[PDB]
């Protein structure tokens, strides 16, 4: 998904 | 095999015990969640703090506060980092409920987390390698 949290960049 | 309700309740049970409160495999998954929340606490503390901010809790606003946070978390998709954050958020809500003399809300929060997992998260988990995919990395 659109990264809105730091953990989104790992996924 | 696991039970989503068992996982939610072990996690909440653990987080309450951390803060000195006594309430009342799925175990391996609960332990995986603790490892992942610990990991994220060292790297995404600002994101955890920003989600837990604006938690002004009253029994008649508890559900609406839960729904707003969790619906914003997953509105444009589900990933494993958002599942970790969902657990952290529900745990924090449970300990804040006890700190503010609203201990009846703990089992409601466990129910809202269980329904939300089952209705909105479970199919994504199953389509993306099951709980095993997560346990494999953090177990």
Residue numbers in the entry:
A (entry chain B): 1 to 11
B (entry chain A): 8 to 31, 89 to 203
What did the study's authors say about this model?
The anti-apoptotic (pro-survival) proteins of the BCL-2 family include BCL-2, BCL-XL, MCL-1, BCL-w and BFL-1/A1. These proteins bind to and sequester the apoptosis effectors, as well as the apoptosis sensitizers, BIM, BID, PUMA, NOXA, BAD, BMF, HRK and BIK5,6. An elongated hydrophobic groove is thus formed along the surface of BCL-2 and BCL-XL proteins, spanning approximately 20 Å to serve as the binding site for the amphipathic α-helical BH3 domains of their pro-apoptotic partners. Herein we present cyclic peptides (CPs) with nanomolar-level binding affinities to BCL-2 or BCL-XL, and further reveal the structural and functional mechanisms of how these CPs target two proteins in a fashion that is remarkably different from traditional small-molecule inhibitors.
